[PDB]
Design an enzyme around this catalytic site. Structure first.
Site, PDB file in Angstrom:
ATOM      1  CE  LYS A  70       2.395   9.325  16.279  1.00  0.00           C
ATOM      2  NZ  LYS A  70       3.211  10.410  15.718  1.00  0.00           N
ATOM      3  N   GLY A  71       0.061   7.113  22.449  1.00  0.00           N
ATOM      4  CA  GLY A  71       0.018   7.167  23.914  1.00  0.00           C
ATOM      5  C   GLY A  71      -1.188   6.496  24.551  1.00  0.00           C
ATOM      6  CB  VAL A  72      -4.532   5.901  23.241  1.00  0.00           C
ATOM      7  CG1 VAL A  72      -5.875   5.264  23.529  1.00  0.00           C
ATOM      8  CG2 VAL A  72      -4.654   7.413  23.204  1.00  0.00           C
TER       9      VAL A  72
ATOM     10  CE  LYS B  74       1.760   7.702  28.749  1.00  0.00           C
ATOM     11  NZ  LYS B  74       2.938   7.613  27.862  1.00  0.00           N
TER      12      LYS B  74
ATOM     13  CG  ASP C 148       5.862   7.849  25.357  1.00  0.00           C
ATOM     14  OD1 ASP C 148       5.142   6.959  25.858  1.00  0.00           O
ATOM     15  OD2 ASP C 148       5.909   8.152  24.134  1.00  0.00           O
ATOM     16  CG  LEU C 149       9.888   2.484  25.069  1.00  0.00           C
ATOM     17  CD1 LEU C 149       9.806   1.166  25.806  1.00  0.00           C
ATOM     18  CD2 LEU C 149       9.867   2.232  23.570  1.00  0.00           C
TER      19      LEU C 149
ATOM     20  CB  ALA D 191       0.356   3.654  27.408  1.00  0.00           C
TER      21      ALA D 191
ATOM     22  CE  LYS E  61      -1.888  -4.047  30.038  1.00  0.00           C
ATOM     23  NZ  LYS E  61      -3.179  -4.723  29.822  1.00  0.00           N
TER      24      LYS E  61
ATOM     25  CD  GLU F 272       3.943  10.934  25.941  1.00  0.00           C
ATOM     26  OE1 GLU F 272       3.741  11.011  24.693  1.00  0.00           O
ATOM     27  OE2 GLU F 272       3.555   9.999  26.647  1.00  0.00           O
ATOM     28  CG  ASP F 273       5.484   9.933  20.644  1.00  0.00           C
ATOM     29  OD1 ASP F 273       5.180   9.585  21.813  1.00  0.00           O
ATOM     30  OD2 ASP F 273       5.175   9.293  19.597  1.00  0.00           O
TER      31      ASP F 273
HETATM   32  O1  LIG Z   1      -0.416  -2.742  23.386  1.00  0.00           O
HETATM   33  P1  LIG Z   1       0.660  -2.131  24.269  1.00  0.00           P
HETATM   34  O2  LIG Z   1       2.020  -2.591  23.930  1.00  0.00           O
HETATM   35  O3  LIG Z   1       0.286  -2.226  25.734  1.00  0.00           O
HETATM   36  O4  LIG Z   1       0.781  -0.574  23.919  1.00  0.00           O
HETATM   37  C1  LIG Z   1      -0.157   0.366  24.415  1.00  0.00           C
HETATM   38  C2  LIG Z   1       0.187   1.749  23.874  1.00  0.00           C
HETATM   39  O5  LIG Z   1       1.557   2.045  24.232  1.00  0.00           O
HETATM   40  C3  LIG Z   1       1.865   3.406  23.944  1.00  0.00           C
HETATM   41  O6  LIG Z   1       3.199   3.585  24.369  1.00  0.00           O
HETATM   42  C4  LIG Z   1       1.730   3.640  22.453  1.00  0.00           C
HETATM   43  O7  LIG Z   1       1.957   5.028  22.216  1.00  0.00           O
HETATM   44  C5  LIG Z   1       0.349   3.259  21.941  1.00  0.00           C
HETATM   45  O8  LIG Z   1       0.378   3.425  20.512  1.00  0.00           O
HETATM   46  C6  LIG Z   1       0.017   1.843  22.361  1.00  0.00           C
HETATM   47  O9  LIG Z   1      -1.301   1.508  21.957  1.00  0.00           O
HETATM   48 MG   LIG Z   2       4.743   7.719  22.546  1.00  0.00          MG
END
Ligand SMILES: O=P(O)(O)OC[C@H]1O[C@@H](O)[C@H](O)[C@@H](O)[C@@H]1O
Ligand SMILES: [Mg+2]
Ligand code: NA
Length: 219
Positions: free
Chosen positions: A45-47, A145, A8-9, A115, A117, A169-170
């Protein structure tokens, strides 16, 4: 021995989970939704961006038009993208750069399973792109996720089975995704947030190749 690590980032490589939280909270308040606090944010988180906005709308049982939904998601993204422009290598979390170096020295594949972009841009900001053998594109998975698809894709992109992989993962959603992929999760954060049933470390300095070996030997 494991053959890949699936990262995960946000909240693992750097403190960008904090910025996603601040940006989503700001957006929620602009539309009169005040329930996005740190506790609620564990559900975000992760969504994905769209699923995050929908969870926030749901919290208030609020309905918006399709046009408004698109604009709100864009507004949050535009804000978040401005917040992250000054991210630099100095923002890489403790232990992460060394882990990447040690994994490559030991011919262990490295893949991104974010997740976000905005993930590629952030790896560039942090001078990390060259460590990654693959980036799983979150726009290309059929399910986000806590579905396991992103972790499965990341493993497959580096020619390794999920069952021969560790995922870092966090998040609640991301831990579930790792579990359901067949990879071995190691979380970073609080057990009160991430559970008491997997290995959890309190901070990323614990993510050493030594420790990932210590954990793998005992699964
Ligand atoms: O809007 P982005 O940059 O595609 O990010 C989507 C998701 O990326 C995940 O890595 C984060 O944990 C989420 O908080 C975030 O909503
Ligand atoms: Mg994360
Ligand atoms: Na205010």
């Amino acid at each position: 021995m494991f053959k890949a690590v699936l990262f995960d980032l946000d909240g693992v490589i750097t403190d960008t989970a904090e910025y996603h939280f601040r940006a989503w909270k700001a957006l929620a308040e602009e539309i009169g939704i005040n329930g996005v606090d740190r506790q609620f944010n564990e559900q975000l988180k992760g969504v994905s961006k769209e699923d995050s906005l929908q969870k926030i709308l749901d919290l208030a049982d609020k309905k918006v038009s399709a046009e408004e939904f698109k604009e709100l998601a864009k507004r949050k993204n535009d804000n978040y993208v401005k917040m992250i422009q000054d991210v630099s290598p100095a923002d890489v979390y403790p232990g992460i750069l060394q882990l990447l170096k040690d994994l490559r020295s030991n011919k262990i594949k490295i893949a991104l399973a974010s997740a976000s972009k905005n993930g590629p841009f952030l790896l560039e900001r942090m001078n990390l792109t060259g460590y990654f053998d693959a980036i799983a594109d979150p726009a290309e998975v059929a399910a986000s996720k806590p579905a396991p698809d992103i972790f499965i894709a990341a493993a497959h992109a580096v020619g390794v089975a999920p069952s021969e992989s560790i995922g870092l993962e966090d998040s609640q959603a991301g831990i579930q995704a790792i579990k359901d992929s067949g990879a071995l999760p190691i979380g970073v954060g609080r057990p009160e947030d991430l559970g008491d049933d997997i290995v959890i470390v309190p901070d990323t300095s614990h993510y050493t190749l030594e420790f990932l070996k210590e954990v793998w030997l005992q699964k």
